[PDB]
Design an enzyme around this catalytic site. Sequence first.
Site, PDB file in Angstrom:
ATOM      1  N   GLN A  17      -2.420 -38.344 115.434  1.00  0.00           N
ATOM      2  CA  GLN A  17      -2.794 -38.824 114.132  1.00  0.00           C
ATOM      3  C   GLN A  17      -2.035 -38.073 113.028  1.00  0.00           C
ATOM      4  O   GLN A  17      -2.134 -36.821 112.883  1.00  0.00           O
ATOM      5  CB  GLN A  17      -4.247 -38.445 113.909  1.00  0.00           C
ATOM      6  CG  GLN A  17      -4.714 -38.976 112.557  1.00  0.00           C
ATOM      7  CD  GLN A  17      -6.184 -38.665 112.298  1.00  0.00           C
ATOM      8  OE1 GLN A  17      -6.839 -37.940 113.081  1.00  0.00           O
ATOM      9  NE2 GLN A  17      -6.718 -39.149 111.158  1.00  0.00           N
ATOM     10  N   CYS A  23      -8.809 -41.376 113.052  1.00  0.00           N
ATOM     11  CA  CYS A  23      -9.280 -40.385 114.011  1.00  0.00           C
ATOM     12  C   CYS A  23     -10.225 -40.998 115.045  1.00  0.00           C
ATOM     13  O   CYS A  23     -10.124 -40.726 116.236  1.00  0.00           O
ATOM     14  CB  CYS A  23      -9.878 -39.206 113.276  1.00  0.00           C
ATOM     15  SG  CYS A  23     -11.371 -39.562 112.347  1.00  0.00           S
ATOM     16  N   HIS A 119     -14.745 -36.090 110.702  1.00  0.00           N
ATOM     17  CA  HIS A 119     -13.664 -36.189 111.667  1.00  0.00           C
ATOM     18  C   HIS A 119     -14.220 -36.499 113.062  1.00  0.00           C
ATOM     19  O   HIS A 119     -15.333 -36.058 113.382  1.00  0.00           O
ATOM     20  CB  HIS A 119     -12.814 -34.909 111.588  1.00  0.00           C
ATOM     21  CG  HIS A 119     -11.510 -34.984 112.384  1.00  0.00           C
ATOM     22  ND1 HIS A 119     -10.649 -36.075 112.286  1.00  0.00           N
ATOM     23  CD2 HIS A 119     -10.890 -34.097 113.194  1.00  0.00           C
ATOM     24  CE1 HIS A 119      -9.597 -35.859 113.025  1.00  0.00           C
ATOM     25  NE2 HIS A 119      -9.712 -34.685 113.586  1.00  0.00           N
ATOM     26  N   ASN A 140      -8.313 -32.610 119.508  1.00  0.00           N
ATOM     27  CA  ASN A 140      -8.173 -33.092 118.139  1.00  0.00           C
ATOM     28  C   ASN A 140      -6.976 -34.058 118.049  1.00  0.00           C
ATOM     29  O   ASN A 140      -5.860 -33.692 118.340  1.00  0.00           O
ATOM     30  CB  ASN A 140      -7.981 -31.914 117.176  1.00  0.00           C
ATOM     31  CG  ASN A 140      -7.899 -32.344 115.714  1.00  0.00           C
ATOM     32  OD1 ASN A 140      -7.965 -33.530 115.377  1.00  0.00           O
ATOM     33  ND2 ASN A 140      -7.692 -31.347 114.869  1.00  0.00           N
TER      34      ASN A 140
END
Length: 173
Positions: A17, A23, A119, A140
Amino acid sequence: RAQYVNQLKNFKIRETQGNNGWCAGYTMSALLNATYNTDRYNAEAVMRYLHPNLQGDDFQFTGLTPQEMMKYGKSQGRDTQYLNRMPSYNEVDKLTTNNKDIAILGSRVESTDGIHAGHAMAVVGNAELEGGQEVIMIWNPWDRGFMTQDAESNIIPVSNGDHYQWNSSIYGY
């Protein structure tokens, strides 16, 4: 460093990303790709499916609600469930063994603004480090690798310096 590692056996980082708000599309695509053992899912296509009518800046930057994430899971054949907290080590181990994927819903601890951004990230599994420390492995979407998260901590330090509290979870992808 670990002599017990339990990961989703087919999880792979395929995309990352950058300048977007996708996300949760990144997260769900990687989880669903892992559990179905496929590469059909990708962040943009998931977001287009949920946001068929957005174009331009709104499509680029509008993320997903928990409800949208849950509906996407169900649409893709998965009995996804909301968990209003972070799982334990034990709960991640069992889910991972059962080839079920976990989405992380976090919020930023830092705030210039008084707003704490949301997130989404993916669990990849769990491990026991040499010396006994229980850790959960996390992807992540920004990153080309994984973070090792103390399973007793619900604050995730991310690669730009920020901290995200792991508020909730959606399991069963």
